[PDB]
Amino acid sequence: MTRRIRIGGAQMGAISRSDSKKEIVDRLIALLRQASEKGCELVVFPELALSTFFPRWYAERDGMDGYFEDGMPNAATLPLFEEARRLGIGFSLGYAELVQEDGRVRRFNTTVLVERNGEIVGKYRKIHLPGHAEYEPERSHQHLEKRYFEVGNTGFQVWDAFGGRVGMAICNDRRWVETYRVMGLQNVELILIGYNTPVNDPLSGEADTLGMFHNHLTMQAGAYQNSTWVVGVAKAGVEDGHRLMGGSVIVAPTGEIVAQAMTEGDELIVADCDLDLCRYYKSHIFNFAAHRRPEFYQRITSQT
Amino acid sequence: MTRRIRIGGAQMGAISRSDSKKEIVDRLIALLRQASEKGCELVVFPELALSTFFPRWYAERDGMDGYFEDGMPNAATLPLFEEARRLGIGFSLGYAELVQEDGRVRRFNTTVLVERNGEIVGKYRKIHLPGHAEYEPERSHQHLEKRYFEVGNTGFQVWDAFGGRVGMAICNDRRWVETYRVMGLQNVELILIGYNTPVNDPLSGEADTLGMFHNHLTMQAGAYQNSTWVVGVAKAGVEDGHRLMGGSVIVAPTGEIVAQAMTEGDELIVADCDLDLCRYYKSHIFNFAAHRRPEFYQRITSQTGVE
Amino acid sequence: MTRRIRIGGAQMGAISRSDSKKEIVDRLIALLRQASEKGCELVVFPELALSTFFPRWYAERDGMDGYFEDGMPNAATLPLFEEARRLGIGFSLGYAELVQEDGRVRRFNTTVLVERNGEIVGKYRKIHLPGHAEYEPERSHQHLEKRYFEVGNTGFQVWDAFGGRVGMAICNDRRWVETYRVMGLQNVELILIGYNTPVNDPLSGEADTLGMFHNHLTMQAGAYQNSTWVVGVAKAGVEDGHRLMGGSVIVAPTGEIVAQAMTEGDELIVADCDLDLCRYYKSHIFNFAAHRRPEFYQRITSQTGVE
Amino acid sequence: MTRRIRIGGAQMGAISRSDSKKEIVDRLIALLRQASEKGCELVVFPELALSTFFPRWYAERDGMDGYFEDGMPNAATLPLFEEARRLGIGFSLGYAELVQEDGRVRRFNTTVLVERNGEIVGKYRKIHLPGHAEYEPERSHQHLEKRYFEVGNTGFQVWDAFGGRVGMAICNDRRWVETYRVMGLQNVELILIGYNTPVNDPLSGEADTLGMFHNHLTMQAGAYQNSTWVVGVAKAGVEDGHRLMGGSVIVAPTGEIVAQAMTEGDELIVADCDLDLCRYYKSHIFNFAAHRRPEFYQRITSQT
């Protein structure tokens, strides 16, 4: 399915330890009305947008649940759904999902996708957990996503959404060619990726002069190599003495950046994304069929 | 120099269908000499570097063999092998392999890797063939590589060579994320990709402005996403009225471009390549613990096409 | 917000010499209505947006005038002025000016700046005419802009418009550093540069691979080195079998590109342009870290050519 | 080989306060032997190559004179020249020139251009002096070039050298379009620029994510808009807890980056540069005299 959709990249400034959830949620609602006054049918929020990036903070493995969410539409998060449904906007919202299964607690790094009528289209849970499970002393900053999260049971699902084929990856998911390719082989036309990337290297304690190089290099190639719109929205800023990288971008099926956010705070980038351009380029069978020969890709499934 | 090589990308200019072999090969020896004048240990030639791009010409499937190679070092291509052993320079060299194997003649888009002592390290046979096998008469130019080559039976091998782990791929293999991963998953540290990419669009008869963007884009993300050196050597220029893109690059395991050709002709670019950055960047994939999941990937190896 | 403008670049598809004026002007109006659906406060149109690129055509140095305008809002272009005022959108609009100034009949390559209330703020007349005065048979395509236009007598003016300071320049003006400097030295907050740039080089009849690279490069440094926004709007497409470059772009005062066009047809990009950033960077990137020493910059006015 | 010069960009690593000038001069001599053993005829050293970047340290205005130079072939630097002479290599060498005159003390940021036969082709002195003159506590790091240096009294001299037209500019000269334009109208074919660029912003003590962006964009467009080779060579590294960017590049008259350095340490980038390609572009359109209309450029001499 295919047509022409206006996406709002709703980049977020910092959130601190101090901030009340009401502030953060008003901050999302403000971006929402902005995308609304701009015709955006879909608006994309970042990873862990209801929170600070608490993986830089050491605590028992059940010591973060305050930052998590017991249900998706919450008392806390319910005005954000009322508004989105009232204005008839859909939104991808990254958050920290708290869920009970067999009587144990299960904690995922989740993004929920909600259709313009206000009803959930789905839920992705982060597959690639970066960081380390334990406290590692010789590092200027900490990254304990493994300590506070389990590998999601979702998989890389691509849904019939917003008049096209929509998929969702999360953050460092975007450095692995698998994330794009898996959703690719599903005819995905719109991959939504929210992200928090620290600006410095933890091993050296220094800034990665190549940080946005890599941030944009992985997404443009994904887009291009898979003929898919790719939307990357940042939570940037200095949270609690820790700077995150901005550079949110809407990327075309061809690899072209069409929208870039110049700040490290709340910023709504925006662009009209013909989903049908994707389906066209996917008709490369004309000449460059170069047809998938899975007989040779086998190593990708014994490891990767 | 803990494990460090001076690679040369010896990008080539045009080859007409009116060019003599000895011409083609003297040119190859020309660039091989150039490299020795710059202390190059490895030299990466282009794809199908002993012949014009005959995939743009129509003919019977067996009708192009006057271009192939009856053996890899033959009488024609022997002096290129001798002047490299003499100089102690390894090379990778792309050609059209004619071979009788499995009791019948076979035809591949091949690259051979020759180590400095003059000994063949490995062969790789192109997997991804683009284009069409029948004449498609609404395009400005024909891409008949499907008609003239068989898919390669090599796999994406990676070899102990030149002090590290060195694989090879050819042309539009550099469009497919798989090419790098598979090789990356054998601890590759250098990937030699020669190529021919017509500048004009086949179905538009007009240049792809994104021709070059896409060239360096896929190769740069490939170096990055597998912490591997990626050397891409073009054959470029107007060949019998068809212009081949240039842009030969040496790209570092950070994705950074460290050498670019600026001509569509015979040209050489040189960089020292620390094969150890690759080994180090792979074990700083620990804080960014992949702990990557091959269970979510199975779509990559199951279906050929797309659901 | 704080002196922010929602600017729209209205990149235009091709114009044949068969195209009616009603067609061209409706298309101009087409984009203007689009830009109102997106709440644009300014609409930057291309250069010579009221006719094709007749510099590619040989003719009497006075037998091009069916492409010129008798007056700036004329009976034909009147609708586009009306509909812009009726919606509250300012615009900048490139055209070919026929005026009986200094007694004689004078001909320029002009853009005009019109504000939201409907009132003309300024007019810039191209200073840098490229190409040649005469027919040049050894060039693949002709550029006769010197033969149909006189040098502009406006200077690089910078008016108070749209909440800040906005200047204008046209096409290959965006190549000469002088363009942004002069205008930036007048505290320009925003620069409108419409353009037609063929993709093929005139000697080779072959597309410059570094055609768009140069395009963005010269306009990005300009935005950067004068802490000014640079909105460059193309007319693009195959026009009567001549292809103009696309790549329209809004560049921020940092040098960053924040909106691009991916097509060579009628297309509109939008971006909120904080005119305050310009004045922020100006008193910081020109900190006491900058002092400009014009005693040494004296060749830029002394001579016109290299020595 | 002719109209064609093999340049080597001799990027340096850190020089800390605690180094001997014998360490430093050896490290430049080390680089010189690599350009010889790689074939270089001209080898370009960076700005302030004989000391740490002392303009980050507060002192009397004659206080940082131990980092300056008595005369150019010193006791300390005389081995660098003798070697360069033997290997028949010319070099650009940046340094803090101390020069006496009319009983007074004059102080410059100076690069000397030495020819392959060992003889000095000339000397440029920085015109564009960044930073401030007095101490300023509201910035995380200091620039006092204006305090310790004087505006140079050479201007952008272009000389005949290496079979071509060679000019010099220094460090943050490379941001001013006047640097390249002035030298281009002299038929410059090769602009040598050494530099030290702190990678944090002084005001915020934040890394300038655009730092290397900006570092390449000014030099590329300079090359292109003036049909010239532009060689840019850094001193990079952490000097006493202050970090300088790297990004040493040889740049074509097309504006194309043809060699780039990956480290923030001693690195020799090298490239073969047709000086005639300049004159091709210079006379294939891009004639200044044909389009230049300096009745309109007049503000460039009245204000800046």
Distances from the Cα of C217 to the Cα of C248, C273, D219, angstroms: 12, 20, 11
Axis crossing angle, helix A211-226 with helix A177-184, rounded to the nearest 10: 20
Phi, psi dihedrals of residue C294, rounded to the nearest 5°? -65, -5
The separation between CA A226 and the C-alpha centre of its own chain, rounded to angstroms, equals 18
Residue D126 falls in the annotated catalytic set? yes
Active-site annotation holder among B41, B47, B69, B97: B47
**The residue type at C147:** R
Do the Cβ atoms of A276 and B162 come closer than 8 Å?
no
In angstroms, rounded to a whole number, what is the distance separating the alpha carbons of residues D7 and A85?
Answer: 64
Q: D53, D10, D65: which is closest to D241 by C-alpha?
A: D53
Q: D164, D155, D24, D142: which is closest to D90 by C-alpha?
A: D164
Q: What are the residues facing A109 on neighbouring strands? A: A96
Chains that touch A (3 or more CB pairs under 8 A): B, C, D
Question: Which helix (H) or strand (E) is D239 found in, with range?
Answer: strand D237-239
Identify which of B207, B238, B245 has the shortest CB distance to residue C199.
B207
- Which residues, in sequence order, are CB contacts of B62 under 8 Å at separation 6+? none
Distances from the Cα of B139 to the Cα of A21, B31, B202, C214, angstroms: 59, 35, 5, 30
**The residue type at A6:** R
Question: Which helix (H) or strand (E) is B237 found in, with range?
Answer: strand B237-239
Do the Cβ atoms of B293 and A296 come closer than 8 Å?
no
In angstroms, rounded to a whole number, what is the distance separating the alpha carbons of residues C39 and A213?
Answer: 33
In angstroms, rounded to a whole number, what is the distance separating the alpha carbons of residues A79 and A52?
Answer: 20
Identify which of B209, B243, B247 has the shortest CB distance to residue C206.
B243
Tell me which DSSP letter residue B76 carries. Answer: T
Tell me which DSSP letter residue C221 carries. Answer: H
Q: A238, A197, A188: which is closest to A218 by C-alpha?
A: A197
Burial code (b: 16+ CB inside 10 Å, e: under 16) for D223-232 equals bbbbbbbbbb
Q: B122, B102, B125, B101: which is closest to B113 by C-alpha?
A: B122
Q: Do A260 and C256 touch (CB under 8 A)?
A: yes
Do the Cβ atoms of D245 and D212 come closer than 8 Å?
yes
- Which residues, in sequence order, are CB contacts of B59 under 8 Å at separation 6+? B148
C-alpha triplet D212, D218, D223: angle, nearest 5°: 125
In angstroms, rounded to a whole number, what is the distance separating the alpha carbons of residues C24 and C49?
Answer: 8
Phi, psi dihedrals of residue A286, rounded to the nearest 5°? -45, -55
User: Which residues of chain B does D38 touch, with a Cβ-Cβ cutoff of 8 Å?
Assistant: 38-39
Tell me which DSSP letter residue B150 carries. Answer: P
- Which residues, in sequence order, are CB contacts of A215 under 8 Å at separation 6+? A174, A195, A197, A232, A245, A247
Do the Cβ atoms of A239 and A15 come closer than 8 Å?
yes
HEC string of C50-68?
CCCCHHHCCCCCCCCHHHC
Q: Do A207 and D207 touch (CB under 8 A)?
A: yes
Q: What are the residues facing C95 on neighbouring strands? A: C110
In angstroms, rounded to a whole number, what is the distance separating the alpha carbons of residues D147 and D130?
Answer: 10
Residue of chain D whose Cα is closest to the Cα of A204 = D238
Distances from the Cα of B161 to the Cα of A198, B81, C140, angstroms: 37, 17, 49
- Which residues, in sequence order, are CB contacts of D63 under 8 Å at separation 6+? none
- Which residues, in sequence order, are CB contacts of C44 under 8 Å at separation 6+? C7, C8, C9, C10, C91, C92, C192, C194, C231, C233
- Which residues, in sequence order, are CB contacts of D111 under 8 Å at separation 6+? D47, D92, D93, D94, D95, D123, D124, D168, D170, D192, D194
Q: Do B256 and D257 touch (CB under 8 A)?
A: no
Chains that touch D (3 or more CB pairs under 8 A): A, B, C
Distances from the Cα of A130 to the Cα of A108, A147, A232, angstroms: 13, 10, 18
Q: Where are the beta strands (DSSP E) in C186-240?
A: 190-195, 229-234, 237-238
Residue D278 falls in the annotated catalytic set? no
In angstroms, rounded to a whole number, what is the distance separating the alpha carbons of residues D83 and D86?
Answer: 5
Burial code (b: 16+ CB inside 10 Å, e: under 16) for B83-101 equals ebeebebbbbbbbbbbbee
In angstroms, rounded to a whole number, what is the distance separating the alpha carbons of residues C53 and C235?
Answer: 9
- In angstroms, this model's resolution equals 3.2
Burial code (b: 16+ CB inside 10 Å, e: under 16) for B30-40 equals ebbebbbebeb
Approach to solving = X-ray
Identify which of A206, A211, A212 has the shortest CB distance to residue D243.
A206
**Per-position DSSP letters for A163-219, written without gaps between them:** TEEEEEEEGGGGG-HHHHHHHHTTT--EEEEEE--BSB-TTTSSB-TTHHHHHHHHH
Q: Do D243 and A199 touch (CB under 8 A)?
A: no
**Per-position DSSP letters for D43-95, written without gaps between them:** EE--TTTTS--GGGS---TTT--SSEESSSS-TTTHHHHHHHHHTT-EEEEEE
Structure-derived torsion over alpha carbons of residues D239, D242, D248, D253, reported in degrees to the nearest 10: -130
User: Which residues of chain A does B135 touch, with a Cβ-Cβ cutoff of 8 Å?
Assistant: none
Q: Do B209 and C243 touch (CB under 8 A)?
A: no
In angstroms, rounded to a whole number, what is the distance separating the alpha carbons of residues B261 and D254?
Answer: 12
C-alpha triplet D211, A270, C28: angle, nearest 5°: 105
- Residue showing tokens 């204005």: A87
In angstroms, rounded to a whole number, what is the distance separating the alpha carbons of residues A79 and B141?
Answer: 58
In angstroms, rounded to a whole number, what is the distance separating the alpha carbons of residues A232 and A228?
Answer: 13
Distances from the Cα of A278 to the Cα of A2, A223, A231, A282, B202, angstroms: 8, 10, 14, 6, 19
Q: Do A262 and C258 touch (CB under 8 A)?
A: yes
Q: Do A38 and C37 touch (CB under 8 A)?
A: no
Identify which of C217, C289, C302 has the shortest CB distance to residue D131.
C289
In total, the C-beta contacts within 8 angstroms joining chain B to chain D are 26
What tokens appear for A4 in the block? Answer: 């022409």
Q: Do A255 and B288 touch (CB under 8 A)?
A: no
For an interface test with B, the pick among A292, A295, A298, A302 (most B C-beta atoms closer than 10 Å) comes out as: A292
Beta-sheet pairing, B229-234 with B237-239: unpaired
What is the strand order of the sheet C257-260 is part of?
C158-161, C164-170, C190-195, C229-234, C249-251, C257-260
Distances from the Cα of C10 to the Cα of A64, B238, C191, angstroms: 50, 36, 15
Domains and CATH numbers, chain D: 4-303 (3.60.110.10)
Identify which of C38, C252, C260 has the shortest CB distance to residue A257.
C260
Distances from the Cα of B97 to the Cα of A189, B66, B94, B105, C93, angstroms: 39, 11, 9, 10, 60
Q: What are the residues facing D92 on neighbouring strands? A: D44, D113
C-alpha triplet D291, D293, D296: angle, nearest 5°: 145
In angstroms, rounded to a whole number, what is the distance separating the alpha carbons of residues B139 and A21?
Answer: 59
Q: Do D209 and A212 touch (CB under 8 A)?
A: yes
- Which residues, in sequence order, are CB contacts of B251 under 8 Å at separation 6+? B216, B219, B220, B222, B223, B229, B230, B231, B232, B257, B258
Chains that touch B (3 or more CB pairs under 8 A): A, C, D
For an interface test with C, the pick among B199, B209, B262 (most C C-beta atoms closer than 10 Å) comes out as: B209
Helix (H/G/I), strand (E/B), else coil: C27? helix
**Taking chain B, what is the end-to-end CA distance rounded to the nearest angstrom?**
48
Q: Do D199 and A211 touch (CB under 8 A)?
A: no
**Chain D, window 129-148: residues with a beta carbon less than 8 angstroms from a chain B beta carbon:** none
**The residue type at A5:** I
Do the Cβ atoms of A96 and A126 come closer than 8 Å?
no
Identify which of C39, C256, C262 has the shortest CB distance to residue A258.
C262
**The residue type at A219:** M
Entry field: residues in chain C:
307
Residue of chain C whose Cα is closest to the Cα of A260 = C258
User: Which residues of chain A does D245 touch, with a Cβ-Cβ cutoff of 8 Å?
Assistant: 209
Q: How far is C211 from chain B (nearest CA, A)?
A: 9
Beta-sheet pairing, B229-234 with B249-251: antiparallel
Question: Which helix (H) or strand (E) is A269 found in, with range?
Answer: strand A267-274
Q: Do D258 and B254 touch (CB under 8 A)?
A: no
**Chain B, window 195-254: residues with a beta carbon less than 8 angstroms from a chain C beta carbon:** 199, 206-207, 209, 211-212, 238, 243, 245-247
Tell me which DSSP letter residue C171 carries. Answer: G
In angstroms, rounded to a whole number, what is the distance separating the alpha carbons of residues B175 and B156?
Answer: 14
- Residue showing tokens 């002007």: C25
Do the Cβ atoms of B180 and B228 come closer than 8 Å?
yes
Q: A64, A107, A73: which is closest to A93 by C-alpha?
A: A73
Active-site annotation holder among D40, D41, D47, D264: D47
Tell me which DSSP letter residue A66 carries. Answer: G
Do the Cβ atoms of B140 and B202 come closer than 8 Å?
yes
**Taking chain C, what is the end-to-end CA distance rounded to the nearest angstrom?**
49
Residue D21 falls in the annotated catalytic set? no
Q: How far is B268 from chain D (nearest CA, A)?
A: 10
